[PDB]
Amino acid sequence: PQITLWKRPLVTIKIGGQLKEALLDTGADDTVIEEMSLPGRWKPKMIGGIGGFIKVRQYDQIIIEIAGHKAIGTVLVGPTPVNIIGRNLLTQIGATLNF
Amino acid sequence: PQITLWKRPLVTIKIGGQLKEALLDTGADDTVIEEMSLPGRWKPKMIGGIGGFIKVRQYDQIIIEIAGHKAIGTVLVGPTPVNIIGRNLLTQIGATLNF
Ligand SMILES: COc1ccc(S(=O)(=O)N(CC(C)C)C[C@@H](O)[C@H](Cc2ccccc2)NC(=O)O[C@@H]2CC[C@@H]3C[C@H]4CO[C@@H](C)[C@@]42O3)cc1
Numbered sequence: 001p002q003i004t005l006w007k008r009p010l011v012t013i014k015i016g017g018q019l020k021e022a023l024l025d026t027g028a029d030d031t032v033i034e035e036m037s038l039p040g041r042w043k044p045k046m047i048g049g050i051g052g053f054i055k056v057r058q059y060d061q062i063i064i065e066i067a068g069h070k071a072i073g074t075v076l077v078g079p080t081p082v083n084i085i086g087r088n089l090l091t092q093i094g095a096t097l098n099f
Numbered sequence: 100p101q102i103t104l105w106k107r108p109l110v111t112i113k114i115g116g117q118l119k120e121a122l123l124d125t126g127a128d129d130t131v132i133e134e135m136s137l138p139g140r141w142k143p144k145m146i147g148g149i150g151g152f153i154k155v156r157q158y159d160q161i162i163i164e165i166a167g168h169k170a171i172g173t174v175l176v177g178p179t180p181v182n183i184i185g186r187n188l189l190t191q192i193g194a195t196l197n198f
């Protein structure tokens with residue numbers, strides 16, 4: 001698909017057996033998902049945005065379906081107000097910015 | 100151009116006579132630039148990201164050249180770690196997300 005940017009670029013994702021809405025975000029290095037339970041070991045991490053830093057749990061090798069496209073990578077879980085699909089997974093579905 | 104996302108999508112902008120680097124950010128509604136002096140009156144705005152809220156100054160109808168494309172629109176000025184080009188100006192230069 002080609003997605004215009006008049007509105008937030010939100011898509012449906014499947015992660016950990018649940019359906020969620022998430023933002024396709026070229027400004028995010030990593031993918032950040034609201035608090036949920038995932039399997040495996042995790043390590044703590046601090047990530048910084050506008051307004052300061054938050055603590056998240058880093059999970060590796062997580063499978064995510066993004067608008068029907070399967071991808072695997074690291075997912076950060078923490079108190080974000082919006083689910084964010086970052087560059088580490090956008091590259092895997094072949095996403096590009098065009099102008 | 101067509102910009103892949105294996106690296107941060109950084110571009111050169113020109114604003115108020117100065118060259119700066121900025122991130123093309125589909126996850127940002129608005130455009131936010133580090134502290135600088137711009138012409139005209141400003142208005143207050145609160146913006147919220149991952150780490151809380153900050154107060155910024157809103158300037159309207161600012162000329163800005165983004166990777167050689169001219170845009171005229173609203174720019175927010177405040178303590179941001181990186182200069183962010185958001186959807187308000189990405190739509191003016193005709194940017195889309197494709198996969
Ligand atoms: C290592 O991995 C990461 C991954 C992500 C982040 S990140 O979330 O911190 N970030 C990184 C940028 C700032 C360098 C990704 C950016 O796309 C963010 C996404 C977003 C949208 C909505 C809510 C939270 C986060 N966007 C935003 O902050 O948008 C807000 C939205 C409301 C208004 C409109 C915008 C103009 O100013 C900002 C503060 C905004 O206020 C950092 C590190």
Ligand SMILES: [Cl-]
Pocket residue numbers: 072073074088089
């Ligand atoms: Cl990854």
